[PDB]
Amino acid sequence: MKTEWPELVGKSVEEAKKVILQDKPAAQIIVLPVGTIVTFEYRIDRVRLFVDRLDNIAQVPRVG
Amino acid sequence: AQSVPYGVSQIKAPALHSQGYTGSNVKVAVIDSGIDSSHPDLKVAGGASMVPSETNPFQDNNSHGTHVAGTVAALNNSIGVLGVAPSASLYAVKVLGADGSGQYSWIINGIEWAIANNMDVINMSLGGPSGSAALKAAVDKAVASGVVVVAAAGNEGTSGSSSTVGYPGKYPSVIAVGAVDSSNQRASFSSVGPELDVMAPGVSIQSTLPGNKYGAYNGTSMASPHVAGAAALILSKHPNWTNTQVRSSLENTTTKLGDSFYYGKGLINVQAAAQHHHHHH
Ligand SMILES: [Ca+2]
Ligand code: NA
């Protein structure tokens, strides 16, 4: 059961959403800007996607 | 009837409560998503919002700041949960919006507000993977000014021999807090590294949620406010102790667990910290 997606770094946010929902269909996906500060609670159902100003994935997506 | 969440017992907060110390007159800023001031198990003394589109710090549209606040200071009464420092003066310093995120400048503005308003303790259950000079300057300024600054270490687990501690936790001036469960085992998600300072309960932690609710959350975010609350208990018993002394008291009286890369100095013990002579148990 996949919890990290290093292969999605540099892909579009759209492709990342698609891929993550194939592996984890009940994921709560939230898109946020890379280089923001975020809450440090752990949510096993959540995958935050950190995007650059072009809307590409800028950091390895992981569950949490 | 009120319930005492296991984490409050685990850090030995009830020993301070039985001595008569509950955080009275200590000002604690929860720098977070806001705090729901309408909750009957919380009393919010003041605050300010640094989020341009969410101007009311007493409205928490995420839930995270209210949960963190309840671990610091949920009221001692016949309802809900009991906080670590239930008499603390609690301030909602809103720097994160509904989605859980904020700009670096909003967090820095919140830290500057806390310093200007003479906060004794800052809790930051938040962070990011990179630092900035301006972020480091703000936390260093708060500490130089006498504030105890506590932050969650992050939930990035392990990465070989690399540190996975987030900023501002990773800065030396800030106490970075990892998460254990009720058996004192490190939570699998808890960040690791030489910057990890102490641990506190961070698994299945019951606290206050907006709209007069309660619930169990997980994270180093939940561990940090046990330590911020503990700092307020310590200051309420020793109001002349400096932030330096409060920090040393917590570090020097932990229950040591495993290797410091994974556990830092171990689990905080506020009973031992608030004595005059300190040693590990
Ligand atoms: Ca209560
Ligand atoms: Na630190």
Q: How far apart are CA B168 and CA B97, in angstroms?
A: 18
Residue B32 appears among annotated catalytic residues: yes
Overall CATH class of domain A1-64 = alpha beta
B123 touches A at CB < 8 Å: no
Whether the CB of B104 is below 8 Å from some CB of chain A: the reply is yes
CA triplet B235, B267, B82: central angle to 5 degrees? 55
Torsion of CA B222, B227, B232, B238, to 10 degrees: 170
- Taking the alpha carbons at both ends of chain A, their separation in whole angstroms is 14
Split into its structural domains, chain B has a count of 1
- CA gyration radius, chain B: 16
> What size, in residues, is chain B?
281
Please tell me which residue in B17, B32, B89, B226 is annotated as part of the active site: B32
Among candidate residues B251, B201, B208, the one with its CA nearest the CA of residue B222: B201
In A, minimum Cα distance to B177 occurs at A40
- Torsions phi, psi for B218 (to 5 deg): -125, 150
Chain A (24-53) residues lying within 8 Å, Cβ to Cβ, of chain B: 30, 32-33, 35-43
Out of B37, B207, B221, B249, the active site residue is B221
Closest alpha carbon to B176 in B127, B209, B143: B127
Q: Which experiment gave this structure?
A: X-ray
Chain B interface includes A64 (CB < 8 A): yes
Helix (H, G, I), strand (E, B) or coil at A2: coil
**Domain limits for position B43:** 1-281
CB contacts of B218 in chain A (<8 Å) are 41-43
Q: Do A38 and B187 touch (CB under 8 A)?
A: no
Q: Which of A24, A64, A15 is nearest to B129 (CA)?
A: A64
**Cα–Cα dist B192/B165, whole Å:** 6
Contact B217, B205 (CB under 8 A): yes
Q: Which residues of B touch A36 (CB under 8 A)?
A: 101-104, 128
**Amino acid, res. B263:** Y
Alpha-carbon span B262 to B186, nearest angstrom: 7
Nearest to B192 by CA among B244, B166, B157, B224: B157
Structural resolution in Å:
1.7
Please give the Cα distance from B98 to B28 (Å, whole number).
22
Provide the CATH number for the domain around residue B216: 3.40.50.200
Q: How far apart are CA B114 and CA B67, in angstroms?
A: 20
Q: How many CB pairs under 8 A join A and B?
A: 75
SS (HEC) of chain B? CCECCHHHHHCCHHHHHHHCCCCCCCEEEEEECCCCCCCCCCCEEEEEECCCCCCCCCCCCCCHHHHHHHHHHCCCCCCCECCCCCCCEEEEEECCCCCCEECHHHHHHHHHHHHHCCCCEEEECEEECCCCHHHHHHHHHHHHCCCEEEEECCCCCCCCCCCCCCECCCCCCCEEEEEECCCCCECCCCCCCCCCCEEEECCCEEEEECCCEEEEECCHHHHHHHHHHHHHHHHHHCCCCCHHHHHHHHHCCCECCCCHHHHCCCECCHHHHCCCCCCCC
CB neighbour class for B132 (10 Å; exposed up to 12, middle 13-18, buried from 19): middle
Phi first, then psi: what are they for B229, rounded to 5°?
-60, -45
Q: How many CB atoms within 10 Å of residue B217?
A: 22
Whole-angstrom Cα distance, residue B219 to residue B127? 13
